[PDB]
Design an enzyme around this catalytic site. Structure first.
Site, PDB file in Angstrom:
ATOM      1  N   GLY A  83       8.732  39.802  46.994  1.00  0.00           N
ATOM      2  CA  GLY A  83       7.709  40.129  47.943  1.00  0.00           C
ATOM      3  C   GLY A  83       8.196  40.491  49.340  1.00  0.00           C
ATOM      4  O   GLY A  83       9.162  39.874  49.841  1.00  0.00           O
ATOM      5  N   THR A 113      15.332  39.682  55.703  1.00  0.00           N
ATOM      6  CA  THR A 113      16.145  39.425  54.522  1.00  0.00           C
ATOM      7  C   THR A 113      16.776  38.016  54.583  1.00  0.00           C
ATOM      8  O   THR A 113      17.196  37.557  55.660  1.00  0.00           O
ATOM      9  CB  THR A 113      17.372  40.319  54.245  1.00  0.00           C
ATOM     10  OG1 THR A 113      17.959  39.793  53.019  1.00  0.00           O
ATOM     11  CG2 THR A 113      18.401  40.254  55.365  1.00  0.00           C
ATOM     12  N   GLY A 114      16.898  37.420  53.396  1.00  0.00           N
ATOM     13  CA  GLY A 114      17.470  36.079  53.330  1.00  0.00           C
ATOM     14  C   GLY A 114      16.411  34.995  53.218  1.00  0.00           C
ATOM     15  O   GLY A 114      16.179  34.538  52.087  1.00  0.00           O
ATOM     16  N   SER A 120      15.529  43.840  52.801  1.00  0.00           N
ATOM     17  CA  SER A 120      16.440  44.884  52.289  1.00  0.00           C
ATOM     18  C   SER A 120      15.670  46.105  51.785  1.00  0.00           C
ATOM     19  O   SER A 120      16.316  47.132  51.544  1.00  0.00           O
ATOM     20  CB  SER A 120      17.252  44.313  51.121  1.00  0.00           C
ATOM     21  OG  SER A 120      16.293  44.142  50.050  1.00  0.00           O
ATOM     22  N   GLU A 121      14.362  46.013  51.543  1.00  0.00           N
ATOM     23  CA  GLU A 121      13.574  47.116  51.010  1.00  0.00           C
ATOM     24  C   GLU A 121      12.589  47.639  52.052  1.00  0.00           C
ATOM     25  O   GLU A 121      11.461  48.061  51.734  1.00  0.00           O
ATOM     26  CB  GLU A 121      12.859  46.695  49.721  1.00  0.00           C
ATOM     27  CG  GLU A 121      13.502  45.831  48.675  1.00  0.00           C
ATOM     28  CD  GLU A 121      12.910  45.812  47.263  1.00  0.00           C
ATOM     29  OE1 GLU A 121      12.998  46.819  46.509  1.00  0.00           O
ATOM     30  OE2 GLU A 121      12.285  44.770  46.880  1.00  0.00           O
ATOM     31  N   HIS A 177       4.675  44.642  48.888  1.00  0.00           N
ATOM     32  CA  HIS A 177       5.555  45.073  47.823  1.00  0.00           C
ATOM     33  C   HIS A 177       5.876  43.882  46.953  1.00  0.00           C
ATOM     34  O   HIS A 177       6.032  42.777  47.504  1.00  0.00           O
ATOM     35  CB  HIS A 177       6.823  45.703  48.388  1.00  0.00           C
ATOM     36  CG  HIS A 177       7.871  45.954  47.354  1.00  0.00           C
ATOM     37  ND1 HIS A 177       7.662  46.738  46.251  1.00  0.00           N
ATOM     38  CD2 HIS A 177       9.158  45.526  47.267  1.00  0.00           C
ATOM     39  CE1 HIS A 177       8.781  46.798  45.522  1.00  0.00           C
ATOM     40  NE2 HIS A 177       9.689  46.069  46.127  1.00  0.00           N
ATOM     41  N   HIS A 185       7.436  42.410  42.712  1.00  0.00           N
ATOM     42  CA  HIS A 185       7.876  42.733  41.359  1.00  0.00           C
ATOM     43  C   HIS A 185       6.935  41.939  40.455  1.00  0.00           C
ATOM     44  O   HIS A 185       7.356  41.302  39.491  1.00  0.00           O
ATOM     45  CB  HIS A 185       9.361  42.429  41.132  1.00  0.00           C
ATOM     46  CG  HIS A 185      10.317  43.081  42.079  1.00  0.00           C
ATOM     47  ND1 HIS A 185      11.695  42.734  42.127  1.00  0.00           N
ATOM     48  CD2 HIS A 185      10.156  44.035  43.038  1.00  0.00           C
ATOM     49  CE1 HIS A 185      12.256  43.456  43.105  1.00  0.00           C
ATOM     50  NE2 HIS A 185      11.349  44.252  43.645  1.00  0.00           N
ATOM     51  N   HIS A 199      10.998  48.852  38.529  1.00  0.00           N
ATOM     52  CA  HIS A 199      11.103  48.078  39.748  1.00  0.00           C
ATOM     53  C   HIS A 199       9.900  47.260  40.126  1.00  0.00           C
ATOM     54  O   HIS A 199      10.115  46.029  40.328  1.00  0.00           O
ATOM     55  CB  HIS A 199      11.541  49.135  40.783  1.00  0.00           C
ATOM     56  CG  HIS A 199      11.686  48.566  42.154  1.00  0.00           C
ATOM     57  ND1 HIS A 199      12.475  49.236  43.088  1.00  0.00           N
ATOM     58  CD2 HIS A 199      11.231  47.459  42.805  1.00  0.00           C
ATOM     59  CE1 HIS A 199      12.440  48.581  44.235  1.00  0.00           C
ATOM     60  NE2 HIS A 199      11.703  47.514  44.083  1.00  0.00           N
TER      61      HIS A 199
END
Ligand SMILES: [Zn+2]
Ligand SMILES: [Zn+2]
Ligand SMILES: [Zn+2]
Ligand SMILES: [Zn+2]
Lengths: 206, 206, 206, 206
Positions: B28, B43-44, B72-73, B92, B94, B155
């Site tokens: 997410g 990130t992280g 990162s995205e 976003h 998955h 993805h």
């Protein structure tokens, strides 16, 4: 990095691994590398009854603490630590989708770019062998030589990483990959996968 | 509408998106439009450790805040904002059923009248492209020209709307549509869908 | 049996219906019979923001309370109350397994003895019709003449009973039956069902 | 080991059995062996409203406590206790995967080494028979002669063990086995199983 801190985290990892639904037949086992062997969850005590004073210490000889029985599935924790020197935590479980793919005896191929989180273009399935025996450990050790997670036929999953947090995360991530293989496998076979070249770019990128 | 209020909501949207089981591989990412760029998750830091002081600000040039790494995205968040001027929040993830349909490389057709919540008679699947690259962003941008959600092959999902609440709701709604495609796809193929005329009436109605 | 008690229960039924995962696209609508019409959930307000002062009262003429918009799917609540005089509560939702069976346009046959909880040997699927229109209500009314729950093609479920508690329970029970049809339908077709004679004994027994 | 302690545990087992999603159509029933008969959950009261003073005591004659109605599915609790003298707790439920395998009328074969937790190389499915009748109890009794769990065609599951904790655990474990049969059954048929020799080694090992 006292014994007791490591014993709490293993307990937190059991409690969180149950949160995500990865520990269902109360098959979960968690171990961390410690001193010259490891700290692991014992046999009998279901997670919510688990106290720091329950964690068993097994040495590199395989001798355990007097008065405490190690998990019944402890020797492949030792095989994973010996085969993968960089591992500092091991996670085992019978999560339902991983185990479902392990009953068909199949590898989970690069159907998604996150497959590269376990070191390569797949998640292999090691051959079946009676739980707790040495022949089972040989399979695990061979399987983890170049991957960080492996299914174990007719049984479940072993995941390993630098610490508990990532190990838990990797096991969780293999379940999602598993589920995705099974859901798409019911519709089409084979399943579309990303090419080896695509997977080498993603590996470089991580 | 201070920075900090927007930083709390993004954090609440992460926590609620995890509630519904949309954020599973901790894939997410949430962004809102702000000033001349956006506020996004970094990130992280896994969501529960997330504090307002973690949210990164990326400008329209793509330059980010000194000392903080953006997700990162992040660049397809920027592509979605540029392609769809009305979007003020991007989601976003998955989520497993969306991603399952994205591995078969299929659009989700009008199998249910709620399909019209994303602007038309389907939810398209944009072609695969290495995460984080510019070629991936071109696909997203082309795909969101006339829809508000899109699957991304091999993805996951990008959903966009007027605010976080609706964006979250739209992503959640695409997962249910996804799941329904997959469950019925296992039984019959093709799946019964509502005609284009029926879908134009429902669109007018919303 | 004051207005306000009925308004709390509808709100509790929304909150509990979400607990069980029956209200996913925030498609749930709950109504109770009251005075000469009903008390129903309004449009816009997602359940957790719902207060007693949100519940709208619609009379038998179809006129509603000044300043409050009824749910967008209210007229088939009125059709169910008129067709089934004994109903005192109505439950609607897009629960995923019911809706999946409703996209194949199939009845759920007596695959399990609990099928008799809805009055007979099946759960019928009423033909599709644009939401909120009168033609949709004619279908619902025809479908509930001799059953207490019905699927609605390309859409979801309407369940009705003596009070909220049973109505909620009946809707929940139809989902489980639904899920069971779909899971076994993927393996074999047709699915083994109990004979009409067996179902008449169970009906007598309840 | 006072009546009231046993009445709390049955209530805790109902509440925990609902936690795991084993008690869905509020079909769950729990019984323990007591005195010359058993302590069982009554009819009507949904689990969360359950108080110690609700548990009904049924004697070996089948006579029950004045003023309290036993569960509607009580006589196969009595058949399980009579057929399996070692059982001290019985668990019943319509858990969805068990029931799904029970609608196909199939045994769950040794697809996983934990199959041996119920005494042998399978989990049998007893033939259908109207709930609550004596012919149903004959089936259960025949089925539990050499196994500790059995599916019941077109209906659900009965599990039995030394105490509530293990009985609950065994029922939970049969559901996971169930789910695994169904998920792999959709892909291939038959499903790969472990040989009778492998299963005799695992049995010895437990
Ligand atoms: Zn194991
Ligand atoms: Zn992603
Ligand atoms: Zn609806
Ligand atoms: Zn039953």
């Amino acid at each position: 990095m006292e014994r007791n801190k490591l014993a709490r985290q293993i307990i937190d990892t059991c409690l969180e691994m149950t949160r995500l639904g990865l520990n269902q037949g109360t098959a979960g086992l968690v171990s961390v590398r410690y001193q010259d062997g490891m700290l692991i969850t014992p046999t009998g005590i279901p997670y919510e009854k688990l106290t720091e004073s329950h964690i068993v210490f097994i040495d590199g000889n395989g001798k355990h603490e007097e008065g405490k029985l190690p998990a019944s599935e402890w020797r492949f924790h030792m095989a994973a630590y010996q085969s993968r020197p960089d591992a500092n935590a091991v996670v085992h479980n019978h999560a339902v989708h991983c185990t479902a793919v392990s009953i068909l005896n199949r590898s989970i191929p690069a159907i998604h770019y996150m497959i590269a989180a376990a070191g390569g273009n797949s998640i292999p399935c090691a051959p079946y062998a009676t739980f707790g025996t040495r022949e089972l450990s040989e399979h695990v050790a061979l399987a983890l030589k170049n991957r960080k997670a492996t299914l174990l036929q007719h049984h479940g999953l072993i995941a390993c990483e630098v610490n508990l947090e990532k190990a838990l995360w990797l096991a969780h991530e293999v379940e999602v990959l598993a589920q995705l293989y099974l859901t798409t496998l019911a519709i089409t076979d084979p399943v579309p996968v990303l090419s080896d070249e695509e997977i080498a770019v993603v590996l470089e990128k991580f």
